[PDB]
Design a binder for these strands. Structure first.
Length: 1326
RNA sequence: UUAACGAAUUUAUGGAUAAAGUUUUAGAGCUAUG
DNA sequence: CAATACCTTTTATCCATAAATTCG
DNA sequence: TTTAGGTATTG
RNA sequence: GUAGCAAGUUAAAAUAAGGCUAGUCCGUUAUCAACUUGAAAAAGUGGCACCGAGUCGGUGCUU
């Protein structure tokens, strides 16, 4: 006796209920709690607002740093351990001094100066080496024994900040000068090639090689500079090799197989000797020279400056930035003193101003500083060498900035290496541990390994060789690198859908190939002259054809089968094959690729080897790393020749299949003794298909399958497995929590129908006209020009693609009056450009039930082709225009018109259908087949979208929140109506497998527009009492039903519930705050009084708790009873939950009433006084309660008043829509009045409302379309939810925030259920 | 995922890295003047 | 108090898997 | 990428 | 304390409090009205028809 309609979105689930005759019911509901209200009537329509679902990504990123920090403090801890023994000899508490660098002198346990204890030597230090970068150069360059404390500072400073690992290989300090390296590259070629010696002459190798151009264009530009040699010639192959390019040297030496050499790819050191051996070892001296140049090129962009004087270019690059800053500061500081010495105090002394004082001491970015002084620079003289420095964006640069990190960790390691090498003679431990220390800088946990856990991390998957602690130096021995790399993918690879306990096999698995061949072979039937009836392929032939034709060639065409097997082996000269199509879709691709390498056809056939051949593909498909493949295959090396193994390691397989090994060959019928595969050959006269095998009740497969699956799962897992946005899953869970409650309301009765629906270029317009009049060559673009912001107007934009001529008439069209000209769809209702055309009269096409007629096509079949070749129309647009010559829109073509429009393509929505449908129909009849009690309809959203505009139910989002229920109601109406009149479409719209045939075009309707039967009158007749033709059921009464629908829309009571949510996540605002004497300053770490060190602020409040107890007041300390709202923060919450009372007493409460403590989540609901509602937004803040029921005449008005997208509809309807504006013109005063009583009743903001009231008074003479739209802003003041700022016309009206929660404490608390219908009300009295 | 194989983008989940920011302290501020 | 005004870490790089989506 | 709750200070 | 002037670019340390399972692990996602039952997962709990409509109001029968 009822039906449910849903409208699912990101932030709301909308829900309404419908009757046989389309009324929405009501019911008296019990009210729990101590309040005198014992009952309420509420309508069975509602919606559920909620905060969006938050993705894990934001969280996961925090995790990356969380590990990034606990691994970096470990790296420095690693250097310190190396020094600990040796350093204590030099400085007893050097490391201690650093640990406590952050403590204030009162809390410091040692000397205040870190690098050296004494005040004198530390000042000398910054005197000589102002930057660490200054020091790095000296530690690299000098030969003098430098203090061990400095060595540590430099080395630890490189290990703390490595730069990035985005390069693999090594770059050298020698390799910066490309020309110096280039000449060696030319030079070696000359010591080897006296028959064709080359001369570098005066080629500019520096400029040509290191350029932002293609790796290809630079190659050509170089050899062009040389006297003329081929890029295919050997020198170019070398030069290409330096360029990050892959060249082939086969052409020069004409080697039997191609051997290319790329410097990024792994296969280079190994590939060299396999190629190098044939030419001989003498050449190799050349190839290393080329590799060196590559390393020269690569860092040619990173370290652009001259680096000839030093082995530490990076620090040298910094030292230059420092001195330039010093130089240019004085010139800037001086030139301001010289000409403008009044602003200098603002510039260099005011921290807050974004001056240099702001740049250094204030919080001002180089982008903010550059901007602020650029005006000053150009008013004083000599400011060119400094202004060119500012446009260069290199002026008064800091050394540590945002653009670094383009630095590759290798150049740091270069300075590290130099420092170690320099000072190892002086310090023995440096020379012993040099390699041990360098690995600290170079080591990176390989991603496939994952976090190195000891079974106590969710994310980890790694495997360990020894249960001992992991360090960068013993990493290979302790960690099973390979078996981790497999576990790495195996945990992300899918499971078998039919048997979800077993792993999916590789897509190129040999067993997968056979199964995939035989499943196509079993359903092949052959008909011959000798035979009366077609017969399935029998057991021998499948096994014959496979041995004969599939092992011999990659793909098997139908002609090969009739010729090679049927005619040759069975001697049938002619035959017809029904089952297979033109060629066999399956192939034995792994067989032949494996057959070619190992070359033992006997080997691939011994079923004893199937275990061994599966393993090679699983290892080959799985693994990326060349070395690790070898480690797995070594066990196989004895079976194989040493040359056979070489090719095996190369072939890699990509992809994962669908089905398990156990499914195909493990599962066995208890009675037949046979597997899935064994039934795929030899299934008797009837050869059964794979689906058929699982779906045969005589076989144990349907019974065995069901055992694995049910062993199924709770709702979360079923919902969470859903693929798609993680917030739209929330609405799903909420939409399904809604349905389960509606059924409870209806006395635990299941409903007949359920309707679910879910909601989801400016310059493009200029370019499709720009180039389409360039190839047309017409002057209609020059004759009248237009702009890039205008073309979102349909009629203007259609003219320009049309070129000023109508496709239906062939004449020049006036630019000024497009209102009289109709926008015409090629196919009667599509509103996109692909199907939109603008002509003076839409009847010129002929019959508006017909395709644009043969009369206009013969006139204009040519003009629309000119537009196609100029991309002024799309192939779909042209093919629907010309379709008149393919007999027009065929019944079978017109069926494709409507059917494609109605069905929902979105995979998520479909899954929602299952979720609902399977949760409803638990009963099964005596047959195996399921009983379809509840019908789950998926409605497209557009249908209702047009229905409201078509039938005067206009939707305005921002006036109100009722439209969420409104769309649910209106999805419920159009849904049940479309299935009442069309049960042939049940299979198309309902998740139900009935079956629907395209053939009809039970005739039903001629008209290609599905949404016609609702219409009382239709633009060219329909009876106002509709009934299905076949059953006689009364489906739609245009007179009777439409009255209730507007009545339901214009209903003033709808249940709107905002889901209550404990707030989770970050403790507090992330920013660090400078020291204060506040008590809201949260400590950063325990030993740090925020008053001395600075701390956090602005804790988020996880939930509020209501505390009724006594507190001490005054020096008198008399105990007086207070009832107030305590904020439990996220940091607090864990501590709170263990012991509430001890925790409460710690915050200052005494004699707390434990029974009465109430935990108040965010968005919790309070009604006080005159029914005004407040939602508790914080322990200390409140939020707006109430939704304003603007009457339907205004909603319908304001949508038409706002004048949405000018007017889209038919022009004759539009005139009365325009007339509706003036007729109801006085409404504007009614709308503004509505708010005033509602403001005073609920909102309590008179301060603001008065500037509102006083603002509307002034703009009375401005047009309605301009005036009404700005009236729409005003509602945001009335909106349920938070106070936010709104602007009328030119005046911004700030928000009214409720910074007291006192009034709540004496109101009645409302606990509402998911629907909003069941409640428990609680009146609060101390 | 398609009546079947490939490719690509996007979103989701996960891993290994990087450079900034912020905070306290260390970089003896001097010279007239109470 | 209740207004009033101000505040809120960001921005890169690479690897893997999966659906869902639009092209072949 | 803007929300909407902490926070301190004023007339 | 004011007026002058010199100066500045760098560094160490922390980067959710913290937790025990002490790992070169983990600590911001999902999930949540209320009441009874539960360690939890979860299960359980709220008569109907009519007339009407400014955020649900009245009446009739059973209860």
């Amino acid at each position: 006796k009822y039906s449910i309609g849903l409208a699912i979105g990101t932030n709301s689930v909308g829900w309404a209920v419908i009757t046989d005759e389309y009324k929405v019911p009501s019911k008296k509901f019990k009210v729990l709690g101590n309040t005198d209200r014992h009952s309420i009537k509420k309508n069975l329509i509602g919606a559920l607002l909620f905060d969006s679902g938050e993705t894990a990504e934001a969280t996961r990123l925090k995790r990356t740093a969380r590990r990034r920090y606990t691994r970096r403090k470990n790296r420095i801890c690693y250097l310190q351990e190396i020094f600990s023994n040796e350093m204590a000899k030099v400085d007893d508490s050097f490391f201690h001094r650093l640990e406590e660098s952050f403590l204030v002198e009162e809390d410091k346990k040692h000397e205040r100066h870190p690098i050296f204890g004494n005040i004198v030597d530390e000042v000398a230090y910054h005197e000589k080496y102002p930057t660490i970068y200054h020091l790095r150069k000296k530690l690299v360059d000098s030969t003098d024994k430098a203090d061990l404390r400095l060595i540590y500072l430099a080395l630890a400073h490189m290990i703390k900040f490595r730069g990035h690992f985005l390069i693999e290989g090594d770059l050298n300090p020698d390799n910066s000068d490309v020309d110096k390296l280039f000449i060696q590259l030319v030079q070696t070629y000359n010591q080897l090639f006296e028959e064709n010696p080359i001369n570098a002459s005066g080629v500019d190798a520096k400029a040509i090689l290191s350029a932002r151009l293609s790796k290809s264009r630079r190659l050509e530009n170089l050899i062009a500079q040389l006297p003329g040699e081929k890029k295919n010639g050997l020198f170019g192959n070398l030069i290409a090799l330096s360029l990050g390019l892959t060249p082939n040297f086969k052409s020069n030496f004409d080697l039997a197989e191609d051997a290319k050499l790329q410097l990024s790819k792994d296969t280079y050191d190994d590939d060299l000797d396999n190629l190098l051996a044939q030419i001989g070892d003498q050449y190799a001296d050349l190839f290393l020279a080329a590799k060196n140049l590559s390393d020269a090129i690569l860092l040619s962009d990173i370290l652009r400056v001259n680096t000839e004087i030093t082995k530490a270019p990076l620090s040298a690059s910094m030292i230059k930035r420092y001195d330039e800053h010093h130089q240019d500061l004085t010139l800037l500081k001086a030139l301001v003193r010289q000409q403008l010495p009044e602003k200098y105090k603002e510039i260099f002394f005011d921290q807050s101003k974004n001056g240099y004082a702001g740049y250094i001491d204030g919080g001002a970015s180089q982008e903010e500083f550059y901007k602020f002084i650029k005006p000053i620079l150009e008013k004083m003289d000599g400011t060119e060498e400094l202004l060119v420095k500012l446009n260069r964006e290199d002026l008064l640069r800091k050394q540590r900035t945002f653009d670094n990190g383009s630095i590759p960790h290798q150049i740091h390691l270069g300075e590290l290496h130099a420092i170690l090498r320099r000072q190892e003679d002086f310090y023995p431990f440096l020379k012993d541990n040099r390699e041990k220390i360098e690995k600290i800088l170079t080591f990176r946990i390989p991603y496939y390994v994952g976090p190195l856990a000891r079974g106590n991390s969710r994310f980890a998957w790694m495997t360990r060789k020894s249960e001992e602690t992991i360090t960068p130096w013993n990493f290979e021995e302790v960690v099973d690198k390979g078996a981790s790399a497999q576990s790495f993918i195996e945990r992300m690879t899918n499971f078998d859908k039919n048997l979800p306990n077993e792993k999916v096999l590789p897509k190129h698995s040999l067993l997968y190939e056979y199964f995939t061949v035989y499943n196509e072979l079993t359903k092949v039937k052959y008909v011959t002259e000798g035979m009366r009836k077609p017969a399935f392929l029998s057991g021998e032939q499948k096994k014959a054809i496979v041995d004969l034709l599939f092992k011999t060639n990659r793909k098997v065409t139908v002609k090969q089968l009739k010729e090679d097997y049927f005619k040759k082996i069975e001697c049938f000269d002619s035959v017809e094959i029904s089952g297979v199509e033109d060629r066999f879709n399956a192939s034995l691709g792994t067989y032949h690729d494996l057959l070619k390498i190992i070359k033992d056809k006997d080997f691939l056939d011994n079923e004893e080897n199937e275990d061994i051949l599966e393993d090679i593909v699983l290892t080959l498909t799985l693994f990326e790393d060349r070395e690790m493949i070898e480690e797995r295959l070594k066990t196989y090396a004895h079976l194989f020749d040493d040359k056979v193994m070489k090719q095996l390691k190369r072939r890699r397989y990509t992809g994962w299949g669908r089905l398990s090994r156990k499914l195909i060959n493990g599962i066995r019928d208890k009675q037949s003794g046979k597997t899935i595969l064994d039934f795929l050959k030899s299934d008797g006269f009837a050869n059964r298909n794979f689906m058929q095998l699982i779906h045969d009740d005589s076989l144990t497969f349907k019974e065995d399958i069901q055992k694995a699956q049910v062993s199924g799962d709770s709702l979360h897992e079923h919902i969470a497995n859903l693929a798609g946005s993680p917030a739209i899953k929330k609405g799903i869970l909420q939409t399904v929590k809604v349905v389960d409650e509606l059924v409870k309301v209806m006395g635990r009765h299941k409903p007949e129908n359920i309707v679910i629906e879910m909601a989801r270029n400016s310059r493009e317009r200029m370019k499709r006209i720009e180039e389409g009049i360039k190839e047309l060559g017409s002057q209609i673009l020059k004759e009248h020009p237009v702009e890039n912001t205008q073309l979102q107007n349909e009629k203007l934009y259609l003219y320009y693609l049309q070129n000023g001529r109508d496709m239906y008439v062939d004449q020049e069209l006036d630019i000024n009056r497009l209102s009289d000209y109709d926008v015409d769809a090629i196919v009667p209702q599509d509103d996109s450009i692909d199907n939109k055309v603008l002509t003076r009269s839409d009847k010129n096409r002929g019959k508006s039930d017909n395709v644009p007629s043969e009369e206009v096509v013969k006139k204009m079949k040519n003009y629309w082709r000119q537009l196609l070749n100029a991309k002024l129309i799309t192939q779909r647009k042209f093919d629907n225009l010309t379709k008149a010559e393919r007999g027009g829109l065929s019944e079978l073509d017109k069926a494709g018109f409507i059917k494609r429009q109605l069905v929902e393509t979105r995979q998520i929505t479909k899954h929602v259908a299952q979720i609902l449908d399977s949760r409803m129909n638990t009963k099964y009849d005596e047959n195996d087949k399921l009983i379809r009690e509840v019908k789950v309809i998926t409605l497209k959203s557009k249908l209702v979208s047009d229905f409201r505009k078509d039938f005067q139910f206009y939707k305005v989002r921002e006036i109100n929140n009722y439209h969420h229920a409104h769309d649910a109601y209106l999805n419920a109406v159009v849904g049940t109506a479309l299935i009442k009149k069309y049960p042939k479409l049940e299979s198309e719209f309902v998740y139900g497998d009935k079956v629907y045939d395209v053939r009809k075009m039970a005739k039903y309707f001629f008209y290609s527009n599905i949404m016609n039967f609702f219409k009382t009158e239709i633009t060219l007749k329909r009876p106002l009492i509709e009934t299905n033709g076949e059953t006689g059921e009364i489906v739609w009464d245009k007179g009777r039903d439409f009255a209730t629908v507007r009545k339901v829309l214009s209903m003033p009571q709808v249940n709107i519930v905002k889901k209550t949510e404990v707030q989770t996540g970050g403790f507090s605002k992330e920013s660090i705050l400078p020291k204060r004497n506040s008590d809201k300053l949260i400590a950063r770490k325990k030993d740090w009084d925020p008053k001395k060190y600075g701390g956090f602020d602005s804790p988020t409040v996880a939930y509020s708790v209501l505390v009724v107890a006594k507190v001490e007041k005054g020096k008198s300390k008399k105990l007086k009873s207070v009832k107030e709202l305590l904020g439990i923060t996220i940091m607090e919450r864990s501590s709170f939950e263990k012991n509430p009372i001890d925790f409460l007493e710690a915050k200052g409460y005494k004699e707390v009433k434990k029974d009465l403590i109430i935990k108040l989540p965010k968005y919790s609901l309070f009604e006080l006084e005159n029914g005004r509602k407040r939602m508790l937004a914080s322990a200390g803040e409140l939020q707006k309660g109430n939704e304003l029921a603007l009457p339907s005449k205004y909603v319908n008005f304001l949508y038409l008043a706002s004048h949405y997208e000018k007017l889209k509809g038919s022009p004759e309807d539009n005139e009365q829509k325009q007339l509706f504006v003036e007729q109801h013109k006085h409404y504007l005063d009614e709308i503004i009045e509505q708010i005033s009583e509602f403001s005073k009743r609920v909102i309590l903001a008179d301060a603001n409302l008065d500037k509102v009231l006083s603002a509307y008074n002034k703009h009375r003479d401005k047009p309605i379309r301009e005036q009404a739209e700005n009236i729409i802003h005003l509602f945001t003041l009335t909106n349920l939810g938070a106070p936010a700022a709104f602007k009328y016309f030119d005046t911004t009206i700030d928000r009214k925030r409720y910074t007291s929660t006192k009034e709540v404490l004496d109101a009645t608390l409302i606990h509402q259920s998911i629907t909003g219908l069941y409640e428990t009300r609680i009146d609060l009295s101390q």
